[PDB]
Amino acid sequence: NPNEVFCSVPGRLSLSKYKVTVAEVQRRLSPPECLNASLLGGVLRRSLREKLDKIGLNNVTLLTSLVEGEAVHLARDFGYVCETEFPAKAVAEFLNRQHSDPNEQVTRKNMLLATKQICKEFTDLLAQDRSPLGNSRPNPILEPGIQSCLTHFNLISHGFGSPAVCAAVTALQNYLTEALKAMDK
Amino acid sequence: NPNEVFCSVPGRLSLKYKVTVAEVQRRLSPPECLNASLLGGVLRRANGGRSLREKLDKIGLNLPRNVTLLTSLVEGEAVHLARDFGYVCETEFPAKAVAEFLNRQHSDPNEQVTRKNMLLATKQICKEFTDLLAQDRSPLGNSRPNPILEPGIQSCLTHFNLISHGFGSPAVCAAVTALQNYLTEALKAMDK
Numbered sequence: 001n002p003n004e005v006f007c008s009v010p011g012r013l014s015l016s017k018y019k020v021t022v023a024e025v026q027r028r029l030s031p032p033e034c035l036n037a038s039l040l041g042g043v044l045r046r047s048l049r050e051k052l053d054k055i056g057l058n059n060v061t062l063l064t065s066l067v068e069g070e071a072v073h074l075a076r077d078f079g080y081v082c083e084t085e086f087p088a089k090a091v092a093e094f095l096n097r098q099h100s101d102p103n104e105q106v107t108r109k110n111m112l113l114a115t116k117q118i119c120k121e122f123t124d125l126l127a128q129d130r131s132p133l134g135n136s137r138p139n140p141i142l143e144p145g146i147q148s149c150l151t152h153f154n155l156i157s158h159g160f161g162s163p164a165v166c167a168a169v170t171a172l173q174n175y176l177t178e179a180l181k182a183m184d185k
Numbered sequence: 186n187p188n189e190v191f192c193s194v195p196g197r198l199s200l201k202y203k204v205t206v207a208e209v210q211r212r213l214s215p216p217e218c219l220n221a222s223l224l225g226g227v228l229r230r231a232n233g234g235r236s237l238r239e240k241l242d243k244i245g246l247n248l249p250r251n252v253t254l255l256t257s258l259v260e261g262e263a264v265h266l267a268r269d270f271g272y273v274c275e276t277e278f279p280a281k282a283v284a285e286f287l288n289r290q291h292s293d294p295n296e297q298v299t300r301k302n303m304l305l306a307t308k309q310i311c312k313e314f315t316d317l318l319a320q321d322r323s324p325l326g327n328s329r330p331n332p333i334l335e336p337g338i339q340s341c342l343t344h345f346n347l348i349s350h351g352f353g354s355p356a357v358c359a360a361v362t363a364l365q366n367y368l369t370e371a372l373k374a375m376d377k
Contacts (some may be wrong), residue, residue, distance in 0.1 A: 012197045013254035015226040042200035061269040062198035064263070070254070077253040078356065085348045086357070087341035094338040095313060114192030114306035121287060122367060146286040156277045164270065167279070168360030172314060 002026070003135045005146075006056065009067045016101050018069030020044065020129070021135050022055055027155055029058055043067065071160040075151050079167035082141050088174030092182050095175070109183055116176045123169050126162045143153045188327045189244065194206055194229050194259045200369045202261030204228065206244055211260075211347055216285050220250035227257065260326050263350040271359030278363040284370030301375055315361050318342070318354045322368050326352045 006025045008017035028035045028043060037048050040151075041063060052058065063071065099108050130138040130147065131154035140147045153161045188208035194202050212219045212227060219227065221234045230237060241248050255263065291300050321333040322339065323346035332339045345353045 011254075013257040015223055015252055015257050039200055060200055061273060062196075062266045063269060063273065065198040069268050074254045077255060078352075081253060081255065081345075081348055081353060086345055086353070087338075090338055090341035091314070091317065094335065095317060111306040111310050114303040115310040118303050118307040118368070119364065121290075122283070122364060125283065125287060136269075143286070146279075146282055149282035151275075153278055156273055160270075161273060161278070164356070165274070165360045165363050168357045169364060170320070171357050172311070172361060172364075175314060176310070 001053075002137070006051075006055065007044055009043075009070075011067075011073070012045075012065060012072045013070060013074065018067045019135070020069075022057070022070050023132060023135065023137070025052075025057060027132070030155075032152060032155055033064070035064075039064070049137050056096065061156075063160055064159065066158040068159045070159040072163065075160050075163035075167060078164050079170060082167045082171040083174070086171040086174065087180045088171060091175045092178035096179055096182050105183060106146050109180065112176050112183075113181050116173060116180075119169050119173055119176070121175075123166045129154070129162050131155075131159070131162075187329065191244070192228055192264075194227075196262050196265070197229075197257060198262060198266065200283075202259045203327070204259050206246070207324060207327065207329070208260050209241070210246055211324070213232050213241075213248055214347075216251065216344060216347055217256070217341075219256075221248055221251065224248070245362045253348075255352050258350045258352065261353045263274065263352040264325065264355065267352050267355035267359060271362060274363040275366070278366065280363060280366030281370045283367045284374050287367070290319075294311070301372065304368050304371050304375075305306055308365060308372075311361050311365055311368070312359060315358045316364075318358050321346070321354050323347075323351070323354075330332050 002023035004022045005019045006022050007020050009020055010017050028040055041048050128142050129150045130140040131151045189206045191206050191209045192204050194204055197331050212224055220238050225233055238248055257366055320334050321342045322330045323343045
């Protein structure tokens with residue numbers, strides 16, 4: 001039963017507990033990570049083999065330590081600070097001022113507009129990711145091939161990866177908006 | 186002495202980081218102004234509060250007083266996390282498959298020159314943007330380099346450094362590298 005709560009794990013980055021489903025434990029034990037019982041015990045912040053047995057089951061970065069609930073919370077907080085704290089306005093003022101030739105202003109505007117359109121298409125694809133995460137197994141809308149590659153990035157990052165990429169590209173998009181606004185003045 | 190080690194803190198994301206007086210002073214000053222309680226948590230100390238306030242007061246840090254998951258991090262682990270994020274952006278993000286997929290949504294032979302000019306513009310605008318983040322000289326760990334940027338933009342990037350404990354600009358550069366790898370794969374694939 002993939003949505004059974006295997007256990008509840010206190011967050012590593014708090015100043016209470018995330019549920020870890022059997023589906024999440026299975027993602028960790030499967031490729032591409034195939035965590036051993038030593039690494040899985042660290043993730044669960046723990047015999048473990050016996051509890052795996054009953055429900056029926058067998059390159060480390062700092063992201064490998066995360067339960068999916070905390071990985072998603074971390075990405076959400078990164079997105080929040082990218083939106084509310086990144087100084088998109090000052091970055092636009094500074095970079096526009098490095099391109100002051102009145103004869104390059106049309107080219108710069110066109111490059112900024114191209115960049116916004118290309119970045120929006122890229123983050124739209126990442127929003128279409130339907131990788132299983134937490135107790136969720138949404139039905140895919142992307143072709144299986146691309147979805148498979150996005151799922152690979154989900155599994156090595158414990159869900160942090162694609163949302164964190166979108167968070168950063170929102171700081172970039174806010175720069176581009178502020179740049180266009182300032183140029184028009 | 187800003188580079189005096191205040192204490193050493195075990196990592197929260199391992200399966201110890203030195204904290205300088207300079208780092209503690211960043212936590213106690215605007216924009217965060219952490220109190221004894223939140224600072225105690227950052228330093229992962231087990232009255233603890235009375236002991237911490239004494240230790241601070243003795244090295245000349247004043248402590249009478251929005252918290253994110255980043256607020257929990259010592260600067261050495263924040264920088265390690267951004268480095269690991271950038272590593273998986275470079276080595277694990279499927280930039281090639283993303284390029285193949287997105288190029289196929291624009292297969293009209295008369296739009297190919299426009300799409301290529303849009304991808305080249307994006308690479309150049311993103312490079313200017315990450316070159317600026319590389320020019321950030323925000324104090325971090327035991328480092329206090331001479332700034333090379335204007336003071337105004339450096340104070341704004343420093344604000345982003347302080348709220349993110351050093352994670353923020355490196356992590357933005359990590360993500361934009363994934364984007365840059367997509368753009369390069371999309372150009373390569375179009376020319377084939």
